[PDB]
């Protein structure tokens, strides 16, 4: 399948498998307004200064449906039509 669903702290989130990738992208329309973000200087691949990427700013507990678990730090960015899941989580997990 192309596509995995998740637990990022207390919410469930559906991506895109993108293994080319180091880290993972969740959409602003998904991320929760309460939850900190903080603007990142970071240089991500194919993402613009100007679409003002920002990152979770704190480390997010993700559990799987066997509730296996670890932590990733996901940015976030406007117009993203999907999350993509990166390797930052995909490499915590037994795929």
Same mark, same amino acid.
């Given at each position: 399948?192309?596509? !995995?669903?998740?637990? !990022?702290?207390?919410?469930?989130? =559906?991506? +895109?498998? *993108?293994?080319?990738?180091?880290?993972?992208?969740?959409? !602003?329309?998904?991320?929760? %307004? *309460?939850? %900190?973000? =903080?603007?990142? +200087?970071?240089? !991500?691949?194919?993402?613009?200064?100007?679409?003002?990427?920002?990152?979770?700013?704190?480390?997010? =507990?993700?559990?799987?449906?066997? *509730?296996?678990?670890?932590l990733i730090k996901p940015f976030v960015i406007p117009n993203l039509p999907v999350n993509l899941w990166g390797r930052d989580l995909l490499?915590?997990?037994?795929?």
């Open positions: 399948k192309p596509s !995995l669903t998740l637990w !990022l702290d207390d919410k469930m989130f =559906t991506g +895109l498998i *993108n293994t080319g990738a180091d880290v993972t992208i969740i959409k !602003l329309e998904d991320w929760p %307004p *309460n939850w %900190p973000i =903080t603007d990142t +200087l970071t240089n !991500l691949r194919g993402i613009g200064q100007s679409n003002n990427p920002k990152q979770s700013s704190k480390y997010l =507990t993700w559990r799987d449906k066997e *509730n296996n678990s670890g490499s915590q997990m037994k795929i």
